[PDB]
CSV table of C-alpha atoms and ligand atoms in Angstrom, one decimal:
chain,number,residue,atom,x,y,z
A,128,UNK,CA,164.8,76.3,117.4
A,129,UNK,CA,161.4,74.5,116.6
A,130,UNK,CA,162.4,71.2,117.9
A,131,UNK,CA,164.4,73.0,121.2
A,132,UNK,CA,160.9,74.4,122.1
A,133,UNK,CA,159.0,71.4,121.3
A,134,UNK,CA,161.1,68.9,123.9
A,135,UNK,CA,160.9,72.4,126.9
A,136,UNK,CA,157.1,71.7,126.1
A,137,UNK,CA,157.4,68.1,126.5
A,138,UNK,CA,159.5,69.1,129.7
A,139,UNK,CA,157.2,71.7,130.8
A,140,UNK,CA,154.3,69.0,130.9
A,141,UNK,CA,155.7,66.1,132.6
A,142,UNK,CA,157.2,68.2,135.6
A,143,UNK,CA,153.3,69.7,135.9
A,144,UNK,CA,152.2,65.8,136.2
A,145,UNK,CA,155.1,65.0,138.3
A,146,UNK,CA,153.9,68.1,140.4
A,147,UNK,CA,158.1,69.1,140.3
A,148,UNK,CA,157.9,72.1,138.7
A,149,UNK,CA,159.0,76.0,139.2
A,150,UNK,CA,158.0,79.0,136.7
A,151,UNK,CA,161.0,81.4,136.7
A,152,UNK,CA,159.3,84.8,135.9
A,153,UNK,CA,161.2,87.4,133.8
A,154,UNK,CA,158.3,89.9,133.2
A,155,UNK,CA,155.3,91.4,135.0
A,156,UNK,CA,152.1,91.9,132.8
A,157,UNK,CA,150.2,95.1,133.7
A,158,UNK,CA,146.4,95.8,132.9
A,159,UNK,CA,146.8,98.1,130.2
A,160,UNK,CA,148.5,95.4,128.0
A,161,UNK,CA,152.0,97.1,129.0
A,162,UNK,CA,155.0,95.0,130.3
A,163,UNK,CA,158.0,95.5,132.5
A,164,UNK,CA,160.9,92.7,133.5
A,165,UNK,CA,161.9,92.2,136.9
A,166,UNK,CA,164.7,89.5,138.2
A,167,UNK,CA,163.9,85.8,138.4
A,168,UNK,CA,165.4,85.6,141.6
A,169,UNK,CA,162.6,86.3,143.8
A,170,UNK,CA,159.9,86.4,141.2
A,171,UNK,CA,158.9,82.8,141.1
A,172,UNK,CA,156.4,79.3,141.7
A,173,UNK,CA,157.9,76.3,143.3
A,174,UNK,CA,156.0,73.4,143.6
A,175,UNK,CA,157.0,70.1,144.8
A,176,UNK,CA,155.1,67.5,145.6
A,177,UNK,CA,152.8,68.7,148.6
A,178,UNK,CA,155.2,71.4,149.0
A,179,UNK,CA,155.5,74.6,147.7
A,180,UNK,CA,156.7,78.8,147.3
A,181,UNK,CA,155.9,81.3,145.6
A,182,UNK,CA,158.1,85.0,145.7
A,183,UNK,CA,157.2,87.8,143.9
A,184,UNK,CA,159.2,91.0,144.5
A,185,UNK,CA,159.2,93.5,141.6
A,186,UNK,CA,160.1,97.7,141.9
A,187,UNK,CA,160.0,98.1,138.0
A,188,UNK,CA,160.3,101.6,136.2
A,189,UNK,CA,156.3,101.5,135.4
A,190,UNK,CA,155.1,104.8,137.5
A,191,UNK,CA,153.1,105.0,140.6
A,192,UNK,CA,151.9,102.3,142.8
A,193,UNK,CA,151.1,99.4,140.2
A,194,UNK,CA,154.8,99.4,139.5
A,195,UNK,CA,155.9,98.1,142.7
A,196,UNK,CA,154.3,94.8,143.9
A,197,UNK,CA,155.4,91.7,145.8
A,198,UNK,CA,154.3,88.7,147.9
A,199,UNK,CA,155.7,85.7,149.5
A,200,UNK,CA,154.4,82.5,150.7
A,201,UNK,CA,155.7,79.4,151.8
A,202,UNK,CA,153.9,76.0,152.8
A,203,UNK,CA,151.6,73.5,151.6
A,204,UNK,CA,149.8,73.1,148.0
A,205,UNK,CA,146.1,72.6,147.9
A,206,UNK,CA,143.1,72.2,145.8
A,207,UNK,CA,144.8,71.8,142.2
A,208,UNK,CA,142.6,71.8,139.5
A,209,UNK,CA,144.5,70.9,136.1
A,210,UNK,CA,142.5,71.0,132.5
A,211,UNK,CA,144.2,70.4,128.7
A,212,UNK,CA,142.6,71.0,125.2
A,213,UNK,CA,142.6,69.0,122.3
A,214,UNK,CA,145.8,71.1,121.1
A,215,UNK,CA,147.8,70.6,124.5
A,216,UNK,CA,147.1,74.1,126.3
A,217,UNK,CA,147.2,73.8,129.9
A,218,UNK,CA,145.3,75.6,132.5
A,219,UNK,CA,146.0,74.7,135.9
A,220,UNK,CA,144.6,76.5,139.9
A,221,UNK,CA,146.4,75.7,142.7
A,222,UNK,CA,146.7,77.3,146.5
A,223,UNK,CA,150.1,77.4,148.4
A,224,UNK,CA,148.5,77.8,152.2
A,225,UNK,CA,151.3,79.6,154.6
A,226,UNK,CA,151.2,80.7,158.2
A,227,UNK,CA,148.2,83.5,158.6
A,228,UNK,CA,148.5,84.0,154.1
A,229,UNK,CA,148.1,82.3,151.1
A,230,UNK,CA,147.8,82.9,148.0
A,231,UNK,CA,145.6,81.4,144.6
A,232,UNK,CA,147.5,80.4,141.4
A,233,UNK,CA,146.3,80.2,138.2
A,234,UNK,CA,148.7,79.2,135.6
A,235,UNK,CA,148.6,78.9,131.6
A,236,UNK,CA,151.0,76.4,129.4
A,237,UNK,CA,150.6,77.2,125.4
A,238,UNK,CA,151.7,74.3,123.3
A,239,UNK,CA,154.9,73.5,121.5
A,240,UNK,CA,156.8,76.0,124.1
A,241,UNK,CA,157.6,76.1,128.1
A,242,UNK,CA,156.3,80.0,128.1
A,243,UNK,CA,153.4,80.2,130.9
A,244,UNK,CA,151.6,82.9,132.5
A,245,UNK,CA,150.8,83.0,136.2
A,246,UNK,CA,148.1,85.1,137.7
A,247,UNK,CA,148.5,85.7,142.3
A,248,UNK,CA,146.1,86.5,144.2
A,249,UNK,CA,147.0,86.7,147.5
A,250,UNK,CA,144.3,86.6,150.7
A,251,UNK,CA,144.6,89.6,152.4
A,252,UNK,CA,142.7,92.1,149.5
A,253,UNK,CA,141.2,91.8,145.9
A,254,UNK,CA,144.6,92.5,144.1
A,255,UNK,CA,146.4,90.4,141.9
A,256,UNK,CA,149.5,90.3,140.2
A,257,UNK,CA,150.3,88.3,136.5
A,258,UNK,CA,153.7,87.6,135.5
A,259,UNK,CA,155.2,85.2,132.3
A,260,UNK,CA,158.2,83.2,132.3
A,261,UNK,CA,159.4,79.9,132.1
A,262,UNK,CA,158.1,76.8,132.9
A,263,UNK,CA,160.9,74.4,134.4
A,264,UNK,CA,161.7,70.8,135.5
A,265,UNK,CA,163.1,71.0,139.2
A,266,UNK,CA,166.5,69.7,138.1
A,267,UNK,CA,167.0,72.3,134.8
A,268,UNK,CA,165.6,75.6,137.6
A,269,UNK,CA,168.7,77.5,138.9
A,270,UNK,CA,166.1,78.5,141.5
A,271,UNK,CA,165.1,75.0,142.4
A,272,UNK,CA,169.2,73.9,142.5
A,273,UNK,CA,170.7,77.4,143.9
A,274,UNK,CA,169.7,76.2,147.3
A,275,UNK,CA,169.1,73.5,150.0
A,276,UNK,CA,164.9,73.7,150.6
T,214,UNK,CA,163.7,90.3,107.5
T,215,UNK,CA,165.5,89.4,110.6
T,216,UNK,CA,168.7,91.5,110.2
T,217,UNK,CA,166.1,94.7,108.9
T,218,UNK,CA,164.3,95.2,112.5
T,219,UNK,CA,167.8,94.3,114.4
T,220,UNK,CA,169.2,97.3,112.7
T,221,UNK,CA,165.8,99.6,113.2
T,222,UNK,CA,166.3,98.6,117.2
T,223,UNK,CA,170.1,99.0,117.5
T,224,UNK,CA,168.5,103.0,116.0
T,225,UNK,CA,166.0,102.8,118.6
T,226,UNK,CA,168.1,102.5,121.5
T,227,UNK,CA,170.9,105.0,119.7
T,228,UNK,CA,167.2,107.6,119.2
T,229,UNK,CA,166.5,106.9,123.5
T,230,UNK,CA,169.9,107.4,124.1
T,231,UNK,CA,170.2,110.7,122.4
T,232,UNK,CA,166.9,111.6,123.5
T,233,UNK,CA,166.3,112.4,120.0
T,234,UNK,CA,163.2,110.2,119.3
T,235,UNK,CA,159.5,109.4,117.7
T,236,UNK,CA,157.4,106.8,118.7
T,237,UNK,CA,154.6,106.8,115.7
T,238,UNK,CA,151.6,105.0,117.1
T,239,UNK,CA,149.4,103.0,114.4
T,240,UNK,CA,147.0,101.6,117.5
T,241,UNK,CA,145.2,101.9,120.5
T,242,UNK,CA,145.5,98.9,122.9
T,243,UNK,CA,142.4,98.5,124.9
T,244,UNK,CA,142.5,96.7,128.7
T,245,UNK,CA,139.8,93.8,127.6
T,246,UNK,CA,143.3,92.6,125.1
T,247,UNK,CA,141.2,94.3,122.2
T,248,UNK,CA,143.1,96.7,120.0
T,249,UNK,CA,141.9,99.4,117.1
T,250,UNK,CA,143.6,101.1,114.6
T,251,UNK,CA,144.8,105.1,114.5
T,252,UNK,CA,146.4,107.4,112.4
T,253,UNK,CA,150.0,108.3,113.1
T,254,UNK,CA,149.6,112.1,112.1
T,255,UNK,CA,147.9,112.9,115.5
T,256,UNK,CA,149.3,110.0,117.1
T,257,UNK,CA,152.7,110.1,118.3
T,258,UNK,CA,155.7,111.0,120.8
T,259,UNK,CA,158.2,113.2,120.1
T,260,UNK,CA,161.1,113.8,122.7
T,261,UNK,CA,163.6,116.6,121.3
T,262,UNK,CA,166.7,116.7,123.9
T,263,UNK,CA,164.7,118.7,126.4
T,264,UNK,CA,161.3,119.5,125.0
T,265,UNK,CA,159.0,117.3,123.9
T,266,UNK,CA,154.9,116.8,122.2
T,267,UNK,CA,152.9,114.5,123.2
T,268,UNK,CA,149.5,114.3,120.3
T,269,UNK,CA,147.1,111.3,120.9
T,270,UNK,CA,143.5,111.5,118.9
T,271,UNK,CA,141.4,108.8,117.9
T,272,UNK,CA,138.2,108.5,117.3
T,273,UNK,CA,137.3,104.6,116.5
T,274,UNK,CA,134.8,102.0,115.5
T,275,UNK,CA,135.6,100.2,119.2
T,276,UNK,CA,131.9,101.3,120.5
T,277,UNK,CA,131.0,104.0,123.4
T,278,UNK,CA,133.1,106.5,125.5
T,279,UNK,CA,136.5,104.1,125.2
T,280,UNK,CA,136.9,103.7,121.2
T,281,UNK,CA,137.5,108.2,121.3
T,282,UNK,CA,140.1,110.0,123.6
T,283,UNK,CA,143.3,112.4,123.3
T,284,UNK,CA,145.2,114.9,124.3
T,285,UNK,CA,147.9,117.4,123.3
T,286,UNK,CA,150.9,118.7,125.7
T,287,UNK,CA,153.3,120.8,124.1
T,288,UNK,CA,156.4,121.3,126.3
T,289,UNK,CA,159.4,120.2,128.7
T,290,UNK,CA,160.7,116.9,129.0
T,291,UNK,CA,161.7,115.9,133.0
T,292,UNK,CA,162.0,113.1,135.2
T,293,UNK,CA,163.7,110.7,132.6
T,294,UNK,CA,164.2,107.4,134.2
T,295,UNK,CA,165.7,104.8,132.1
T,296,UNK,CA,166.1,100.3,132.8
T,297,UNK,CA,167.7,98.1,130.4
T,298,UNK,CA,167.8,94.2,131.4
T,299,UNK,CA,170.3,91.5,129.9
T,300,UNK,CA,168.3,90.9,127.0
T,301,UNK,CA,167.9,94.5,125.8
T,302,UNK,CA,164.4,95.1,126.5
T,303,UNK,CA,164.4,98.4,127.9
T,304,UNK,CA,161.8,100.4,130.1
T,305,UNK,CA,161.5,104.2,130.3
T,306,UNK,CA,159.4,107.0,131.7
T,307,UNK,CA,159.3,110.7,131.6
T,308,UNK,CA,157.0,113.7,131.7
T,309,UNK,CA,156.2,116.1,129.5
T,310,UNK,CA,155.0,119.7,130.5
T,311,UNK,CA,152.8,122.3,129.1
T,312,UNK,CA,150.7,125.0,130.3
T,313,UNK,CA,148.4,124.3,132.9
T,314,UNK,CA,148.7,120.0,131.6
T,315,UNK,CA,151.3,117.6,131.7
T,316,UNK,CA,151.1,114.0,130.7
T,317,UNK,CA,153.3,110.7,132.7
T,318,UNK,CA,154.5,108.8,129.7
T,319,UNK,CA,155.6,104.8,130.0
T,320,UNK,CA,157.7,103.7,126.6
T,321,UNK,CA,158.6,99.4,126.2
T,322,UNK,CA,161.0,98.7,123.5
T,323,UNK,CA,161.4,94.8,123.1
T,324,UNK,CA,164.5,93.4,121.6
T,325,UNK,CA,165.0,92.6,118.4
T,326,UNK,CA,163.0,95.1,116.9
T,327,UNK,CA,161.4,98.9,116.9
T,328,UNK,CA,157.9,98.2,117.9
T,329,UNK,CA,157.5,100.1,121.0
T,330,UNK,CA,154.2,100.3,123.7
T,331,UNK,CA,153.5,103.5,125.3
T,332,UNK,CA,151.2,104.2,127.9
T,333,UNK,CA,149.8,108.5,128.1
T,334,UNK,CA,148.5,109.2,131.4
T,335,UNK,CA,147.4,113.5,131.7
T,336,UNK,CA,147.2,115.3,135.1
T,337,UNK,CA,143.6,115.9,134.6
T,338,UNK,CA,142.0,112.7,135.5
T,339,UNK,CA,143.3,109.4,136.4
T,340,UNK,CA,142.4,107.6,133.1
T,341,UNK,CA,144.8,106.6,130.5
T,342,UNK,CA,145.8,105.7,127.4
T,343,UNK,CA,148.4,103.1,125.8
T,344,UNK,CA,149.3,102.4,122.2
T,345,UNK,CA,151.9,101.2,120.2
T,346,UNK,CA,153.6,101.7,116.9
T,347,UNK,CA,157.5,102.7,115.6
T,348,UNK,CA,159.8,104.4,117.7
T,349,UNK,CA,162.3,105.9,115.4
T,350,UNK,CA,165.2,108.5,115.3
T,351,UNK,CA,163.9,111.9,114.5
T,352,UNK,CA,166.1,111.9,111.0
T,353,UNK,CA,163.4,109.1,110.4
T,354,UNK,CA,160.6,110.0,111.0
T,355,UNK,CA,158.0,111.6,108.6
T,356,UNK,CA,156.3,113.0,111.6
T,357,UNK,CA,159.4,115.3,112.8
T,358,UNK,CA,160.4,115.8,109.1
T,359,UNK,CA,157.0,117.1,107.8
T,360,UNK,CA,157.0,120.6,109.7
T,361,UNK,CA,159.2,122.8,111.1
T,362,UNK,CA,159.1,123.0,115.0
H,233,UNK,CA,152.2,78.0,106.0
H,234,UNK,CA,152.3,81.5,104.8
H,235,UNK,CA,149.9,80.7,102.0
H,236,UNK,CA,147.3,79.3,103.8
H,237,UNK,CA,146.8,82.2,106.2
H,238,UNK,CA,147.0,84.8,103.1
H,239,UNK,CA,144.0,82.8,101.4
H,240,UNK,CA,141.8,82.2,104.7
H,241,UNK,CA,142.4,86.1,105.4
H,242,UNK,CA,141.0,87.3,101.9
H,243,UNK,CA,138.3,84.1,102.6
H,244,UNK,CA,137.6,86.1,105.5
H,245,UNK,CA,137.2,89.5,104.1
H,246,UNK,CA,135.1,88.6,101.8
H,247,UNK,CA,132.6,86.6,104.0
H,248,UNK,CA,132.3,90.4,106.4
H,249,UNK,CA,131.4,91.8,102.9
H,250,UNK,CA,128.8,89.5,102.0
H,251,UNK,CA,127.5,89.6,106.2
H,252,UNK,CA,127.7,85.5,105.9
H,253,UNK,CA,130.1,84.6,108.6
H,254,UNK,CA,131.1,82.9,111.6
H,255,UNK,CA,133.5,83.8,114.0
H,256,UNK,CA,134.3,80.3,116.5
H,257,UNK,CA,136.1,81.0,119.5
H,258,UNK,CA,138.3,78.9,121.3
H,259,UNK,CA,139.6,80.6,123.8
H,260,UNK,CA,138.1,83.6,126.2
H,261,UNK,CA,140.6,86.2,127.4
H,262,UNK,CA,140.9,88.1,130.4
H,263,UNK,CA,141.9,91.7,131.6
H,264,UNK,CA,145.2,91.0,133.2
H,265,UNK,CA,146.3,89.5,129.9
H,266,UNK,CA,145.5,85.6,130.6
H,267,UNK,CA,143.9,83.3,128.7
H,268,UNK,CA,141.5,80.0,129.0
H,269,UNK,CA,140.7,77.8,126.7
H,270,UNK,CA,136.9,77.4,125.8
H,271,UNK,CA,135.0,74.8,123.6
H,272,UNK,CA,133.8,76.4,120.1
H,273,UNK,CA,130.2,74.7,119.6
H,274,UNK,CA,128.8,76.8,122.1
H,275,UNK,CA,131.4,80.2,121.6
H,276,UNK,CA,130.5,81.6,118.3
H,277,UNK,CA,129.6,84.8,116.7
H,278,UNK,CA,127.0,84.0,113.2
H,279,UNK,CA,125.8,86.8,111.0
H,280,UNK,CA,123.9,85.3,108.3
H,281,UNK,CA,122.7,88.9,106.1
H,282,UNK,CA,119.8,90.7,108.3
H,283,UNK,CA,120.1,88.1,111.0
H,284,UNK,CA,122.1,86.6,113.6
H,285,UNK,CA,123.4,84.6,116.8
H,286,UNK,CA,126.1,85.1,119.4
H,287,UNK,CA,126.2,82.4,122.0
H,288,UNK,CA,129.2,82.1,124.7
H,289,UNK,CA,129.5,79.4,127.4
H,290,UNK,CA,132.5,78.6,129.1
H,291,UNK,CA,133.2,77.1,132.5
H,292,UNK,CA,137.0,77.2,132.9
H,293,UNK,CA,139.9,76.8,135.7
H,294,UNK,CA,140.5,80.6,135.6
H,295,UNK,CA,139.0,80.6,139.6
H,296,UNK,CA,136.4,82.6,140.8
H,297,UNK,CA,133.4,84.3,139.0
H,298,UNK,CA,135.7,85.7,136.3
H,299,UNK,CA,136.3,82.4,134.9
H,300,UNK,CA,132.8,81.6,134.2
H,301,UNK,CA,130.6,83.5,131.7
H,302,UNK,CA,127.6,83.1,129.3
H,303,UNK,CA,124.8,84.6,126.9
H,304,UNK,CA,122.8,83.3,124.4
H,305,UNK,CA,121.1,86.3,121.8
H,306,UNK,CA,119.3,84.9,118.6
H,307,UNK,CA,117.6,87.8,116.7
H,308,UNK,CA,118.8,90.6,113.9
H,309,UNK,CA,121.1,92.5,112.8
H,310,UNK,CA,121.6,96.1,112.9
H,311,UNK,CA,124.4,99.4,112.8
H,312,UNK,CA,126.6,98.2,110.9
H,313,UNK,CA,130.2,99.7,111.3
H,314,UNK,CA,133.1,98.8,109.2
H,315,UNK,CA,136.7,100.6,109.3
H,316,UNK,CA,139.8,98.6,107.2
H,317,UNK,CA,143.0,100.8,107.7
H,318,UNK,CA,145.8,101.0,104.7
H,319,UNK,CA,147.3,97.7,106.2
H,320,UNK,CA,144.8,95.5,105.3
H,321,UNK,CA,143.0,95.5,109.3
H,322,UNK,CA,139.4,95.8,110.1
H,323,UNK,CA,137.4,96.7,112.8
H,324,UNK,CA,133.9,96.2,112.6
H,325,UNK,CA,130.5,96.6,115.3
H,326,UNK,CA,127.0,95.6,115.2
H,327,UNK,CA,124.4,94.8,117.3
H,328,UNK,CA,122.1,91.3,117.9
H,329,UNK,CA,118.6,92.4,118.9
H,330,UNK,CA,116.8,89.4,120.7
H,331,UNK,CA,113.2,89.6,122.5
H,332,UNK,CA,114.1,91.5,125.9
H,333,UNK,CA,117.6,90.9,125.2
H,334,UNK,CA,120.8,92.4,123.2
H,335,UNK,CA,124.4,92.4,122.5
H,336,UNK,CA,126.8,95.0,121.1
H,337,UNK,CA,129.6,93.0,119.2
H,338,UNK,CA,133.4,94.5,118.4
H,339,UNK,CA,135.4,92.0,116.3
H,340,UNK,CA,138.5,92.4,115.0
H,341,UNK,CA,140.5,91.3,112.0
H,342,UNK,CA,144.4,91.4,111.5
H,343,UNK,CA,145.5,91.6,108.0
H,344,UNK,CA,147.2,87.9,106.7
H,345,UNK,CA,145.0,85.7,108.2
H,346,UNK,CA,141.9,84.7,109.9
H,347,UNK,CA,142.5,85.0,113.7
H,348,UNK,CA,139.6,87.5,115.0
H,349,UNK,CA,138.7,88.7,118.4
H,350,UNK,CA,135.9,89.9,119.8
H,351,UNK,CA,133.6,91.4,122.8
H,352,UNK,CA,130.5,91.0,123.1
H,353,UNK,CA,128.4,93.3,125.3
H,354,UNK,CA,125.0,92.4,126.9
H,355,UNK,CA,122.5,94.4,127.1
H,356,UNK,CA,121.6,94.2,130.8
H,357,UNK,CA,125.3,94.5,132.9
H,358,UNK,CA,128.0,97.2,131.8
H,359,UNK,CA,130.4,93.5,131.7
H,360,UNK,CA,131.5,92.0,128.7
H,361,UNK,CA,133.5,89.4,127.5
H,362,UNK,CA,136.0,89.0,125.0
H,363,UNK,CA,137.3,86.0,123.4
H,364,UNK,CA,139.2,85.1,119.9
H,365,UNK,CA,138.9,82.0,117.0
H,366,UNK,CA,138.9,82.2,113.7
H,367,UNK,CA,136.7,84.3,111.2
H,368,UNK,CA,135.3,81.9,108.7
H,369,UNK,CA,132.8,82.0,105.9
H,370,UNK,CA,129.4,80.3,106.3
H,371,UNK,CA,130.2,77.2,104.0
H,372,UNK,CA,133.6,76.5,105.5
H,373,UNK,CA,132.1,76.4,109.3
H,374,UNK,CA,131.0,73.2,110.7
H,375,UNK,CA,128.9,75.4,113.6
H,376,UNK,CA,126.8,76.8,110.5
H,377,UNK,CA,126.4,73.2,108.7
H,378,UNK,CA,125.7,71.1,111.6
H,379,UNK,CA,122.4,72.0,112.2
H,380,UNK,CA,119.4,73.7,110.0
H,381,UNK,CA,119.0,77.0,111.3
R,521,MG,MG1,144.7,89.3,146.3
R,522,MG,MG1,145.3,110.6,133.4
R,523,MG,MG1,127.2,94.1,129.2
């Protein structure tokens, strides 16, 4: 169990450097410190290479409008910014630039696991939305392999 | 250890089910990730097939107009919505109805365990309150036991 | 493992009682439940009896004004408030009164070990930050014995 999380952390850092990488999201973080789960399906980052997606699409039983949220953009990745600590937590920016939207990425890797935290922000107002899942070679997502890109 | 809280949430779900519950809070979560502690006595939510109490008071050493709030509605239970994913996590929501007041309640139950987060939000104003603690069957709890209702 | 947290949390009781401590941070968290990592010689909370120092500083990859933050108060002590539940947890305020300048601190102890959180208020914005590290007597912190103060 200790040694399984240890070698997805291992994982979890070389396909950041590789820039091959998608977080498979399975919850959505709210404000208040409350949580709901949503499907992995269209709640996702994909980066590759220059490349990259992100989906978010959740309609969760939290009440009123901060329940419900979504975004998707596809195109290009810009302007990454990547920074580790003497213990091997990551923080890492990126934008994914689409046609007329786009969206800024922050993402958070704690060491000795592939748990990470993503925070989108798209362009169009102030909002945000933070979600936590799994961070994911290309070749181990079901996301990454479900499809032809 | 282990096999102790996967029996207290196998009860949990069983006490939802029913709708026959008590979640006993023993803090107040604050938005900044901060938390304080509270007394369960005047903290709690108790959901009795179709009527329900909802007590929140705290008054805490976290400093200004944040670290005190509450509220009492004494009532009907309505609206019960209810999602469970593949892992067991579930998500829930109801109402509860008084007099003149009614609070929107939010109640997360992770997997694996009884530990529950529920988030208070009265008619009155648009400000809330979430805190976590127990959720237990009523035949459990000290809080249904101690009176009669 | 287990040991070592049990002594370092009764360290760290003891070093609130006696108002000789020093909480180091290393990392600052956010609202939406994110983190960033932050370096601890210039993130620290020292009470040393009647007087004390908070200084934060941190210049992260959390984008956009959010992910930078900073205040430096040297000065004394004052309203002291401590509150340790049945569990073993504390919550604790006081304030750091500067020349033209002050803080209102909140920190934050969990019972069986010495992780601690904190926000720190400034006296001239309604904004605060809050970050976490561990709670350490006077003699066992290098921030406190690398320098004369
Ligand atoms: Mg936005
Ligand atoms: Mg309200
Ligand atoms: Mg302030």
């Amino acid at each position: 169990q200790q040694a399984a999380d240890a070698v997805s952390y291992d994982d979890a850092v070389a396909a950041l450097k590789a820039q091959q990488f998608v977080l498979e999201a399975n919850q959505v973080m709210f404000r208040n410190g409350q949580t709901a789960f949503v499907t992995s399906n269209t709640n996702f980052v994909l980066v590759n290479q220059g490349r990259g997606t992100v989906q978010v699409a959740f309609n969760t039983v939290y009440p009123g409008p901060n329940g419900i949220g979504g975004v998707t953009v596809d195109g290009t990745v810009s302007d990454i910014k990547t920074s580790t600590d003497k213990r091997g937590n990551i923080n890492c920016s990126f934008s994914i630039q689409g046609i007329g939207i786009s969206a800024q990425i922050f993402l958070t890797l704690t060491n000795g696991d592939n748990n990470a935290t993503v925070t989108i922000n798209p362009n169009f107002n102030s909002n945000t939305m933070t979600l936590s899942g799994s961070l994911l070679p290309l070749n181990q997502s079901n996301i990454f392999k479900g499809r032809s890109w």
